[PDB]
Design a protein around this ligand. Structure first.
Ligand SMILES: *[C@]1(O)CO[C@H]2[C@@H]1N(C(=O)[C@H](CC(C)C)NC(=O)c1ccc(-c3cccs3)cc1)C[C@@H]2F
Length: 216
């Protein structure tokens, strides 16, 4: 089977935690994280990819009004590249597309979607590929004040997908199975920017409902 636990931070696949600000660009941060993990696997180099590039240029999404990660992967594919954060830095508002192919740091060969609501499939994809872009319900104040432990709240609504984050691994803590979740609300949020979310507790917060990863 797949390993009982996995943590792609220990493999050097995950860049530091970012702060998206109040632009609704969670989808772009989610997408770049997935891409970052696949680029590391491909080239051996860890580097920051450009969420702004996605915000300004993914005409199928709505910039700071939100988007889907699948749309973003498709754009990187059709565009034949995504810029680095250094070449195309984050400013947290919408601007006209300024993609420059000379600053290209990664490509994409399409994407795959995890079978809806299937936490075993999500687990096996993480294990086999690397970090996976996920959508969740993050609307409860209990989520937003998270400090420690494995997060579980029965009021989480798996049909209310209102935030996009990154699953960088999974495992267990005091007997509670979990997903290791990189947020994009800065290092002062949660535990150094991260949250452990309940795993195999009936698809808590819709964790496995809109999960996808890029091919490279
Ligand atoms: C995110 O920063 C968290 O709060 C904001 C941002 N957000 C999203 O980006 C959503 C992420 C999904 C749950 C994965 N996506 C959307 O809101 C969204 C908006 C618009 C589209 C379009 C499809 C065709 C044209 S525009 C798709 C997805 C939720 C909230 F807005």
């Amino acid at each position: 089977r797949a390993p009982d636990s996995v943590d792609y931070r220990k493999k050097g696949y995950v860049t530091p935690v970012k702060n998206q600000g109040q632009c609704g660009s969670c989808w772009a941060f989610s997408s770049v994280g997935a891409l970052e993990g696949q680029l590391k696997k491909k080239t051996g180099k860890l580097l920051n990819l450009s969420p702004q590039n996605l915000v300004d240029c993914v005409s199928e999404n709505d910039g700071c009004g939100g988007g889907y990660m699948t749309n973003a992967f498709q754009y990187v594919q059709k565009n034949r590249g995504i810029d680095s954060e250094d070449a195309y830095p984050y400013v947290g508002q919408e601007e006209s597309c300024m993609y420059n192919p000379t600053g290209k740091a990664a490509k994409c060969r399409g994407y795959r979607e995890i079978p809806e609501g299937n936490e075993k499939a999500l687990k096996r994809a993480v294990a086999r590929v690397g970090p996976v872009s996920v959508a969740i319900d993050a609307s409860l104040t209990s989520f937003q004040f998270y400090s420690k432990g494995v997060y579980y709240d029965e009021s989480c609504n798996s049909d209310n997908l209102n935030h996009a984050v990154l699953a960088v691994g999974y495992g267990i803590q005091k007997g509670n199975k979990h997903w290791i979740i990189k947020n994009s609300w800065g290092e002062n949020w949660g535990n150094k920017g991260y949250i452990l979310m309940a795993r195999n507790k009936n698809n808590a917060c819709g964790i496995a409902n809109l999960a996808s990863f890029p091919k490279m």
